[PDB]
Structure 1
Amino acid sequence: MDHAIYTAMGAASQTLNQQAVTASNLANASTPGFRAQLNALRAVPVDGLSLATRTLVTASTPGADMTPGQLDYTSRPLDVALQQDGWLVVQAADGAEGYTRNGNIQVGPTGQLTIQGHPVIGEGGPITVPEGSEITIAADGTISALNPGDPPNTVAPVGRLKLVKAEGNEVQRSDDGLFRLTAEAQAERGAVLAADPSIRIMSGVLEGSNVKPVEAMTDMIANARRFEMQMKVITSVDENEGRANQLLSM
């Protein structure tokens, strides 16, 4: 054939990949502490002899969007929201250290703090709270525990949440949705990120997802139009080859 069909076909398939990324972003429009994935087409030119005429296209995801999200006021002392460019630290699935923005902190029957089922990490490691005690979280992450039955004079600090500062260019979303330091950024900032004392959190507010609707809509419209354009090129190339095959007769 004329491999021009293999260019428009790639452009049509990567458009479906982009649509699958955008639809995934739209599905998580209500996920607490969600970071939308950025999608971008990139052109790769095929090198060779003689005339460079073919340039294929692939969909890539250049990190995520770190724009602080919406803040819903839920009058719950455990749901916290972070200052812009600030991350909470939890223990990842494989016993590693991961970063998140979901402040929906839950207390188990044994007293351990968890986020989405992952243990919460402080300066002393995972945080264990006295069993069945009221928890208040300060602006700088200090945790006060009140034991029921005892007077409010008993309120004393227990542990401090680990709050780190990381930009978009330094973190990469792992396969389980937890952000981790990229290789270059890890090599310069060390393996574990030191807690930043300047990070402030707000207790009683939960951060929503930063999925922008207007950009999503425009992206879907553009993707549909591009897919139709590639289909019209594919049809034209197929029609051309069908007659060109007549040259072999007689």
Structure 2
Amino acid sequence: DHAIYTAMGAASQTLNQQAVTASNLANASTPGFRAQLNALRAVPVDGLSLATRTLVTASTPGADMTPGQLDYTSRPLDVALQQDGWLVVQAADGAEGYTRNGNIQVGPTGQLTIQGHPVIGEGGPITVPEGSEITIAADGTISALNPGDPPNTVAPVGRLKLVKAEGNEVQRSDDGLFRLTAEAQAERGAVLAADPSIRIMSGVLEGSNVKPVEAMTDMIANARRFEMQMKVITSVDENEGRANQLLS
């Protein structure tokens, strides 16, 4: 009578896994995206006397840090980081976040943004002089040349804050930015200092890293697992009916 609940848990968590996979597939064109991993954990129910019932719980263990494919766009402000490297932005709630989106934009007032989040440089958010032409070097250095003014007047303005962090040290926040895990925060500090060993390429944008093969295989597996759980539910549903209706 309670195997129906085990099968129902399996089917519901299969639905959750399918939702995760569909959300990953919907962002196949999202610039600088990290796919969410999925794994079904098994929870064994304790008790007496013969432990037979073990339930299923869907989980998302971090994300995927494999870089995607770089689109070469003839623009100086689109940048791509090294493998396992992160650009730093000031998060929505005045905090710090890390990302791979190298689509740096400028405003009328001259401040650099990523998805609207100001970029954080050595001494707090980077601000470029109003209406200047900007070039980004291979180590984060930013040069600004005013339009029409001796090209001998090009001078650096600041340096981007580029950090290095692996998947174990990084957890996705609800606003799409990545942050440090508590166990990584305890060791590497609240704020990560700039890592000078990371090279950055200017003029190339990093796309998403969702793998179509894994997504399609996962969808097929989810469908088949759901059908098997429905069969288990149906088998349990007939037996209980007969039993009660007759042994009364």
Shift of 1:68: 1.0
Shift of 1:247: 3.6
**For 1:94 and 1:159, how far apart are their aligned partners in 2?**
24
Shift of 1:149: 1.7
Aligned to 2:168, the other structure's residue is in SS state: helix
Number of residue-to-residue matches in the alignment: 248
Alpha-carbon displacement from aligned partner over 1:96-144 (angstroms, at most 9, x marks no partner): 0000000000000000000000000111110000000000000000000
Alpha-carbon displacement from aligned partner over 1:165-192 (angstroms, at most 9, x marks no partner): 0000000000001000000000000000
**For 1:82 and 1:179, how far apart are their aligned partners in 2?**
15
**For 1:204 and 1:149, how far apart are their aligned partners in 2?**
22
Aligned to 1:139, the other structure's residue is in SS state: coil
Alpha-carbon displacement from aligned partner over 1:180-210 (angstroms, at most 9, x marks no partner): 0000000000000010000110000000000
Shift of 1:69: 1.1
Shift of 1:246: 2.7
**For 1:102 and 1:246, how far apart are their aligned partners in 2?**
62
Alpha-carbon displacement from aligned partner over 1:58-84 (angstroms, at most 9, x marks no partner): 000000000011100011100000000
**For 2:108 and 2:87, how far apart are their aligned partners in 1?**
22
Alpha-carbon displacement from aligned partner over 1:153-174 (angstroms, at most 9, x marks no partner): 0000000000000000000000
| Correspondence list, 1:157-176, <5 A | 157-176=156-175
**For 2:127 and 2:93, how far apart are their aligned partners in 1?**
20
> Which position in structure 2 is the counterpart of 1:73?
72
Alpha-carbon displacement from aligned partner over 1:34-57 (angstroms, at most 9, x marks no partner): 000000000000000111000000
| Correspondence list, 1:129-208, <5 A | 129-208=128-207
Aligned to 1:121, the other structure's residue is in SS state: coil
**For 1:147 and 1:186, how far apart are their aligned partners in 2?**
41
Percent of counterpart pairs with the same letter?
100
Aligned to 2:194, the other structure's residue is in SS state: coil
TM-score, normalising length from structure 1?
A: 0.98
**For 2:49 and 2:98, how far apart are their aligned partners in 1?**
49
Aligned to 1:150, the other structure's residue is in SS state: coil
**For 2:158 and 2:68, how far apart are their aligned partners in 1?**
27
What is the alpha-carbon root mean square deviation over aligned residues?
A: 0.6
TM-score, normalising length from structure 2?
A: 0.99
Aligned to 2:184, the other structure's residue is in SS state: helix
Aligned to 1:8, the other structure's residue is in SS state: helix
Aligned to 1:81, the other structure's residue is in SS state: strand
Q: Which runs of 5+ in 1 are unaligned?
A: none
> Which position in structure 1 is the counterpart of 2:52?
53
**For 1:64 and 1:139, how far apart are their aligned partners in 2?**
27
Matched, 1:9 2:8: yes
Alpha-carbon displacement from aligned partner over 1:194-227 (angstroms, at most 9, x marks no partner): 1000011000000000000000000000000000
- Spell out structure 1 runs of 4+ moving beyond 4 A: none
Shift of 1:248: 3.6
